[PDB]
Amino acid sequence: KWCFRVCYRGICYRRCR
Known part of the structure; x- marks a missing residue:
């Protein structure tokens, strides 16, 4: 369980998964 910075359009x- 660790959060991370993500991108898209x-x-x-x-998000934290």
């Missing part, structure tokens, strides 16, 4: 975020 010109958009990024920080």
Whole structure:
């Protein structure tokens, strides 16, 4: 269980899996 910074269509975020 660790969070990370991810991106997509010109958009990024920080999801925790």
